[PDB]
Design a protein around this ligand. Structure first.
Ligand SMILES: [Rb+]
Length: 460
């Protein structure tokens, strides 16, 4: 029984979600730069590049409040095989809040879009172009919710819709852009106006997968149909909040903090690229990896949580964990080689490859400890309120990390080190391996007794 049944089902479960979830990222990122940079990038005169950049930036924060409307969707809990129903209303409910948020964000949207801060050039251009192409990315989150139930939750959990709008999504974007970003066959557009239009068509397709793969459930029924408002479930939404609030600010409010530091500590040279290029890019993607595992094990841990209420921990926990280290490990320890050519990455010259190669190094290891931090956290703890204190945990490694890490760049500015820039980039890792330690002492919390339905007695 020891490890036998563990790695067995552990392995399985993870992958069924693994491959799914992974490909999905290829959507986000894949589609992301694809139709985005491709056209509105080397076309609106690179004024497509930097312009559309700040564009979806603002959105970045937004999509943030969006994950709040996603841990709700981990609520794929009430199907521990138990209430394989009651979820339909639980869901419909979420979806509502979906809109009840996108709008609270449209505000921020329209207005600042008209305000920017300066008048560079992205103004007019990106500004309102993607501007109403953003009204588009409000109807997107609605779909996002669908994904909640299906996509990830997938009724019980059959994360397949990934590759659905996945391979299908990115595909579409491409030509939709072509003809629109300029193409012309009813109207020829511009870069920002482009990536943007491509976007309208996105939540379009998304809806497609929405209704479709969901109310069609080629395999199941036990679905939706009649729904309604709510004030107390919307108080449970205040729980969808007091669960989603701990994630929204976390990952994204933090997203701003992330931004903060680096920049602040980005005047440390032309390295900007080194740092920027290296770290950011490559990493971001390897990060994309362990995060994949998370929501898998996060949901996977959340379904096995609800059956006989067995040992999903050692499983989902000790499993998911054990493996991301591989991926982190494997990706990290494979990363090592790829420096030089990876370095290339952003098509240029020697431009940092050396220190880049060095900075490159920093990432491999981050990916490592980062991985560990992700998983446990957002996943196991991602189950519920842990999300509340996984959040606390979040900033614990933050303030400690960064200031410690910048003051590491700055320790050069203090004690002493071979390169304050690279090195400060590093202090950041300290943060992630630091917080990564933090959720470990969240070691289930005394593990689970019957304080499990207690988490769902404050979550139910
Ligand atoms: Rb990061």
């Amino acid at each position: 029984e020891n490890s036998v049944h563990r790695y067995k089902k552990e392995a399985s479960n993870l992958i069924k979600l693994a491959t799914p979830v992974l490909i999905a990222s290829v959507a986000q990122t894949g589609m992301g730069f694809v139709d985005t940079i491709m056209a509105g990038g080397v076309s609106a005169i690179d004024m497509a590049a930097v312009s559309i950049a700040a564009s979806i930036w603002l959105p970045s924060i937004l999509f943030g409040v969006g994950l709040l409307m996603a841990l709700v969707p981990v609520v794929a809990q009430l199907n521990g095989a138990g209430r394989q129903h009651k979820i339909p209303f639980e869901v419909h409910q979420g979806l509502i809040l979906a809109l009840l948020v996108s709008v609270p964000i449209i505000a921020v949207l329209f207005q600042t879009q008209f305000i920017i801060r300066f008048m560079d050039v992205e103004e007019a251009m990106a500004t309102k172009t993607v501007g109403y192409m953003h009204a588009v990315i409000f109807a997107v989150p609605a779909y996002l919710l669908f994904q909640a139930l299906r996509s990830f939750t997938d009724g019980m959990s059959l994360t397949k819709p990934a590759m659905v709008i996945g391979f299908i999504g990115l595909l579409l974007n491409i030509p939709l852009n072509w003809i629109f970003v300029y193409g012309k066959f009813g109207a020829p557009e511009l870069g920002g106006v482009g990536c943007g239009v491509a976007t309208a068509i996105v939540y379009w397709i998304m809806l497609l997968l929405l209704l479709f793969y969901i109310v069609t459930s080629k395999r199941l029924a036990h679905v939706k149909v009649f729904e309604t408002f709510h004030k107390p479930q919307p108080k449970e939404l205040i729980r969808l909040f007091r669960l989603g609030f701990p994630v929204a600010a976390a990952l994204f409010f933090e997203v701003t903090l992330f931004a903060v530091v680096a920049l602040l500590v980005a005047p440390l040279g032309s390295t900007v690229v080194a740092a920027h290029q290296v770290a950011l890019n490559f990493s971001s993607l390897v990060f994309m990896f362990p995060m994949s595992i998370g929501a898998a094990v996060s949901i996977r841990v959340g379904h096995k949580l609800g059956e006989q209420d067995t040992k999903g921990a050692a499983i989902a926990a000790n499993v998911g964990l054990m493996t991301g280290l591989a991926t982190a490990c494997i990706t990290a320890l494979l990363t090592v080689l790829f420096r030089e050519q990876i370095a290339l990455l952003y098509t240029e010259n020697q431009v940092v490859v050396a220190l880049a190669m060095q900075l490159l190094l920093f990432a491999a290891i981050y990916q490592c400890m980062d991985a560990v931090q992700v998983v446990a956290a957002g996943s196991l703890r991602g189950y519920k309120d842990m999300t509340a204190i996984f959040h606390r945990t979040f900033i614990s490694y933050w303030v400690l990390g960064l200031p410690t890490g910048y003051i590491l760049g700055m320790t050069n500015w203090l004690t002493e080190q071979p390169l304050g820039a690279k090195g400060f980039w590093l202090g950041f890792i300290i943060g992630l391996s630091a917080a990564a330690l933090m959720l470990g002492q969240r070691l289930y919390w005394l593990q689970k007794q019957s304080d499990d339905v207690q988490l769902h007695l404050a979550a139910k």
